[PDB]
């Protein structure tokens, strides 16, 4: 069933400035007229986010960019799509991307936001495809080549129904959809924001906060992911399913979150209006320290510079003598409790791993020392 | 299921009665961390995790936060800040067959201690030493799984025990599992003590004009004081003001 898409165009990855986007509400607690300092996984200000296109340039040897690679998930993803016809049909998440391990699929096929958790046997080039019928100008599902099989489904959720148009539009970009995906503590948290824009390049200067959308209690292993796009088949692309396809102009941006401390301003009317990234530059560090968005003239103490350790060195004596533990453990004769036998252990190398891992001892406890660290301690003397 | 493949089930969007289990007296061990069982009927939790497995009786206490052991390290680890309950009852009469029952296995060898609430299903050969395994056991290559010698005539210490661990996770999110309790008509403009979906307090409730966007549940002040709450069964926003007080 899966079409092995070929004839890709080679293009180096592009980057663009993330500006001050990627700020989301960290919790459901309402706040107002406050500046809250929260440490969470955020998108750093003024970073590079990777660019991906969806276009087929008309003309001889025109550029045919269908950017659908497998990207790592790392520790959260900021996914910002600029659109006017809603080409993207959702996302897939997984590590092996086969039936061997569990995987996640979010599909928005203009009916519902259907989330499935299955061991999908993903195709080599998973996608969705709509065949265009020119006579009645009707778009309908014709190909689902995201997976070759579906099994042992562990979770499925459906959002509110709707009917979104997939007709191609001309002119400037009008829709900007920002999403944040996190996979922490057994929960998959999806935050979103929609913005009407009037521009053709870059991201808007305005600051917007991404309100939460769904928190799925799934709890699955995730390291990589991949987006899904809806191609069009019609008379403009003659041929079979392998070559007769096209994709409307659209773009998306991928950024990676990381643990940062942010100062968020909940305004008087209940909405997040500004944020400060503490570790962006010394001025923002001062702003975070003072818990204010403006600073007057003066000198402020903020942090403490320190040079970090580089490598570890261990200096131990040249004496590689094994301690006589078998003299006591591998012993058939044992004295009475009132005449308890005492042996001294010194000037030898002791390996406590074998004693702990022998598993022949019903009771084994340690007072004042953690057992698992005995292998990394040096002692003056031992009494058995 | 086996202890290394403990079965995990999600409990939410339902009413739970923990008094029937405590008053059942059919469980050998009923021990809770972070919650008193007699008050569990008055609490609301965001989610409940039920981890069921079968272990040996002598290891009934082995599953506990901060404890050490092969089962804890490689089969089922509890977090240091574990909140919930542990339930255990003998299953010799129900899960042990004549000649011994070996359907239950436990992992003995692993590269590292399991993270709490981690499911391990791999049965790869553990390489104890420097000798490569390459799918071949022997010296420095041993099978990590061991059967449970659940002989019915064996001692009760080694008799099989069914163990269910309930993890009540609660966040600043709308609660799903709630005790029986009862919903009562709210009264405003009067100093009353309230229990809103688990969170208890005392004050006067007033109609509020603060926008609670559809995802907030309760707003708080500079301190950890719930300044506003969202009432279930009405989706109305109530400001909580401390009852009038002063010096004399």
């Amino acid at each position, epitope marked *: 069933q899966c079409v092995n898409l070929t004839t890709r165009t080679q293009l180096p990855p592009a980057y663009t400035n993330s500006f001050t986007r990627g700020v989301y509400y960290p919790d459901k607690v309402f706040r107002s007229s406050v500046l809250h300092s929260t440490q969470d996984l955020f998108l750093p200000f003024f970073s590079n986010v990777t660019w991906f296109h969806a276009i087929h340039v008309s003309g001889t040897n025109g550029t045919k960019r269908f950017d659908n690679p497998v990207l790592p998930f790392n520790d959260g993803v900021y996914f910002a799509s600029t659109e006017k016809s809603n080409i993207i049909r959702g996302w897939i998440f997984g590590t092996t991307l086969d039936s061997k391990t569990q995987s996640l699929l979010i599909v928005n096929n203009a009916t519902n936001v259907v989330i499935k958790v299955c061991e999908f046997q993903f195709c080599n080039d998973p996608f969705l495809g709509v065949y265009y019928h020119k006579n009645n100008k009707s778009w309908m599902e014709s190909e689902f080549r995201v997976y070759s099989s579906a099994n042992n489904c562990t979770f499925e959720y459906v959002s509110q129904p709707f009917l979104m148009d997939l007709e191609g539009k001309q002119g400037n970009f009008k829709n900007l959809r920002e999403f944040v995906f996190k996979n922490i503590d057994g929960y998959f948290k999806i935050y979103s924001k929609h913005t009407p824009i009037n521009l053709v390049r870059d991201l808007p200067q305005g600051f917007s906060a991404l309100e939460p959308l769904v928190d799925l209690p799934i709890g699955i292993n995730i390291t990589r992911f991949q987006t899904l796009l809806a191609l069009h088949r019609s008379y403009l692309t003659p041929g079979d399913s392998s070559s007769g396809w096209t994709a409307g102009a659209a773009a998306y941006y991928v950024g990676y979150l990381q643990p940062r401390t942010f100062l968020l301003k909940y305004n008087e009317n209940g909405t997040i209006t500004d944020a400060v990234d503490c570790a962006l530059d010394p001025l923002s560090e001062t702003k975070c320290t003072l818990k204010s968005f403006t600073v007057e003239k003066g000198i402020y103490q903020t942090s403490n510079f320190r040079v970090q350790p580089t490598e570890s060195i261990v200096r131990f004596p040249n004496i590689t003598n094994l301690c006589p533990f078998g003299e006591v453990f591998n012993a058939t004769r044992f004295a009475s409790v009132y005449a308890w036998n005492r042996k001294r252990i010194s000037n030898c190398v002791a390996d406590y791993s074998v004693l702990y891992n022998s598993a022949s001892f019903s009771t084994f406890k340690c007072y004042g020392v953690s057992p698992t660290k005995l292998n990394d301690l040096c002692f003056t003397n031992v009494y058995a | 299921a086996s202890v290394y493949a403990w079965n995990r089930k999600r409990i939410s969007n339902c009413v739970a009665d923990y008094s029937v289990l405590y008053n059942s007296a059919s469980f050998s061990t009923f021990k809770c961390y972070g919650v008193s069982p007699t008050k569990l009927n008055d609490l609301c939790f965001t989610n409940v995790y039920a981890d069921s497995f079968v272990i040996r009786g002598d290891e009934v206490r082995q599953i506990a936060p901060g404890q050490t052991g092969k089962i804890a390290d490689y089969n089922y680890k509890l977090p240091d800040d574990f909140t919930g309950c542990v339930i255990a009852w003998n299953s010799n009469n129900l899960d042990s067959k004549v000649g011994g029952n070996y359907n239950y296995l436990y992992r003995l060898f692993r590269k590292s201690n399991l993270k709490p609430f981690e499911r391990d299903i791999s049965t790869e050969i553990y390489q104890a030493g420097s000798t490569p395994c390459n*799918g071949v056991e022997g010296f420095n290559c041993y099978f990590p799984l061991q059967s449970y010698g659940f002989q019915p005539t064996n001692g009760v210490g080694y008799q099989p025990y069914r163990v269910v661990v309930l993890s009540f996770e609660l966040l600043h999110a709308p609660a799903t599992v709630c005790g029986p309790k009862k919903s009562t008509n709210l009264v405003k403009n009067k100093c009353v003590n309230f229990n809103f979906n688990g969170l208890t307090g005392t004050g006067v409730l007033t109609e509020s004009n603060k926008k609670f966007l559809p995802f907030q549940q309760f707003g708080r002040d500079i301190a950890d004081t719930t300044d506003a709450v969202r009432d279930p069964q009405t989706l109305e926003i109530l400001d909580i003001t401390p009852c009038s007080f002063g010096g004399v």
Partner: nanobody
Amino acid sequence: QVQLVESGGGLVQAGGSLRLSCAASGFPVYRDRMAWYRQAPGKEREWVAAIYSAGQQTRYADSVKGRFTISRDNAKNTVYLQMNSLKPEDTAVYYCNVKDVGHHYEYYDYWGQGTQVTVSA
């Protein structure tokens, strides 16, 4: 309590096939792992084959994988080892081995009497 009985084998001419039987008494065969060991005079102990009821069904040595077959019978509760395309080098004593755990967390390996296999050129 736990007893393993080995049957079959003996002296066989070249080109034949053999079937050894390890019968377990005192405990059901369905457990973690049943191992089969082969050793010649003047040789040290080394793992040869094993069958498991969980995870990977069977494991074998690198030089023996995919050649000599094993199976189990729960209804009759016995492990059968079928060996084909015999060679004179197969003359050795074979054991079937189990691992048992008691109240004191001990891990004891219990062997069988074994069978002698000799192949004549």
